Design a binder for this molecule. Structure first.
Ligand SMILES: Nc1ncnc2c1ncn2[C@@H]1O[C@H](COP(=O)(O)OP(=O)(O)OP(=O)(O)OP(=O)(O)OP(=O)(O)OC[C@H]2O[C@@H](n3cnc4c(N)ncnc43)[C@H](O)[C@@H]2O)[C@@H](O)[C@H]1O
Length: 186
């Protein structure tokens, strides 16, 4: 099955574009954030540890997040023609370990937004939906971590040759036209 990495900053619009991909193409959307938050909601001790880390805007250990991604892929294996891996990899080692344990991506969709745009979108969502990490101090930490740890992921897959950038400053449906173009050309 096809594996597509979807990578971009906090609030760049990854999840929004992924849900549109699902509706149009039928791919299986796996969000590392959603999987982690599901563990938090379980009330487990691990969930309490994950909640602490995520509330501070920090990266969860590779071992945990890759386990959950693999778990989810296996659970959907019978019915998936392709996978959207949304929010993983966030560091080069995460990409490397995924390829070691699961397989290689055929495409990385780089959902590109401005830093100020991401701050605005997350501040707005925070005031609306009240997600714990959508507070101003944590947003700043998330964005800084994205720049430091995750942008080298883009470079890695540029070296691989599979990055297609989409301009997430555009309206959602206009971004999705760029997304659709990349997927159609697979
Ligand atoms: N691999 C990993 N390794 C280690 N730790 C990990 C990990 N993955 C997760 N974690 C941990 O979990 C935490 C959270 O991870 P995660 O859940 O992946 O959070 P995130 O990376 O910050 O992504 P978001 O869901 O916040 O934003 P998004 O890019 O999907 O944008 P969205 O479509 O929602 O849109 C955002 C807002 O903007 C709106 N919007 C979207 N697109 C547009 C557009 N074109 N125009 C106008 N508004 C738009 C949306 O309606 C919405 O309101 C991490 O910080 C980390 O602690």
């Amino acid at each position: 099955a096809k594996i597509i990495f979807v990578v971009g900053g906090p609030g760049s619009g990854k999840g929004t574009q992924c849900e549109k991909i699902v509706a149009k193409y039928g791919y299986t959307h796996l969000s590392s954030g959603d999987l982690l938050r599901a563990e938090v909601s379980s009330g487990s001790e691990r969930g309490k540890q994950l909640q602490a880390i995520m509330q501070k805007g920090e990266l969860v250990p590779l071992d945990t997040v890759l386990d959950m991604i693999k778990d989810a892929m296996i659970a959907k294996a019978d019915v998936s023609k392709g996978y959207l891996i949304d929010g993983y990899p966030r560091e080069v080692k995460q990409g490397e370990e995924f390829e070691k344990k699961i397989g290689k991506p055929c495409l990385l969709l780089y959902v590109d937004a401005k830093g100020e745009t991401m701050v605005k979108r997350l501040m707005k969502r925070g005031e609306t939906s009240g997600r714990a990490d959508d507070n101003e101090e944590t947003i700043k930490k998330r964005l800084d971590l994205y720049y430091k740890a995750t942008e080298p992921v883009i470079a890695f897959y540029e070296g691989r040759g599979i990055v297609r950038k989409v301009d997430s400053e555009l309206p959602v449906d206009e971004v999705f036209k760029q997304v659709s173009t990349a997927i159609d050309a697979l």
